[PDB]
Each structure stands twice: as structure tokens, then as C-alpha cells.
Amino acid sequence: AVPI
Amino acid sequence: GTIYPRNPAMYSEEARLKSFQNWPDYAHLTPRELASAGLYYTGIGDQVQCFACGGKLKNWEPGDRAWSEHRRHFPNCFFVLGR
Ligand SMILES: [Zn+2]
């Protein structure tokens, strides 16, 4: 996944 | 206290689980797994957020696990470090  | 959750209401695993009522049908991870790792649904895409550190995770890939993504990207989260 991609973190923000 | 010396730590403070970004979202106190989502302190509860049950509250986090409820947030997935409208989790999209394409999103492969289960609400059970996500909520157990501290994560609740933001209502946008497949984007979840941690009640503790406030980190957000989206664009989940096959083979991703909730806990391992949470720890990889937000290793200093108190929920990660308290587990
Ligand atoms: Zn966190």
C-alpha cells in the first residue's frame, strides 16, 4: 500500500 | 497523558469495524483485519486511517497485510509499538  | 490518539472515537475496535459499512467491493482486505490493525475507513477509495498515529494507507496490493503495511510505513506509531 501507499502511505499518506 | 504523554501520547494522544489522532481519533479518540476510533479508539474502539468495534467503532473501527462499523466504519467499513460501505467499504468498496473491489477492496480485498477484510474490515476485520484492518480494524484489528488500528485502521478505520475514511470513506474515500480504499483509504484507511490509523486512530492512533493518524497515518493513512491506500492502494492496497495483493499480498499486503494490514499490520505489516502499518508497521512498514508508520513504525513509530504507538499502536504499532504497543502491539
Ligand atoms: Zn498507526
Numbering used by the authors:
A (entry chain B): 1 to 4
B (entry chain A): 151 to 233
Paper quotes:
XIAP (X-linked inhibitor of apoptosis) directly inhibits the upstream caspase-9 and the downstream caspase-3 and caspase-7, and therefore controls critical apoptotic checkpoints. The XIAP protein consists of several domains, including three zinc-containing BIR (baculovirus IAP repeat) domains (BIR1, BIR2 and BIR3) and a C-terminal RING domain. The linker region blocks the active sites of these caspases, while the N-terminal regions of the partially processed caspase-3 and caspase-7 bind the BIR2 domain in a peptide-binding groove that accommodates the four N-­terminal residues.
Smac also binds in the same groove of XIAP through its N-terminal IAP-binding motif, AVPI, and associates primarily with the BIR3 domain, although it also has affinity for the BIR2 domain. Therefore, the structures of XIAP BIR2 with five different peptides soaked in and bound to the Smac binding groove were also solved: ATAA, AVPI, SVPI, AIAV and AMRV. The additional hydroxyl introduced by the serine substitution results in only a small shift in the side chains of His223 and Leu207 to allow the extra atom. We have shown in a series of peptide-bound structures that the protein is somewhat flexible and can adjust the conformation of the side chains in the binding groove to accommodate differences in the peptide.
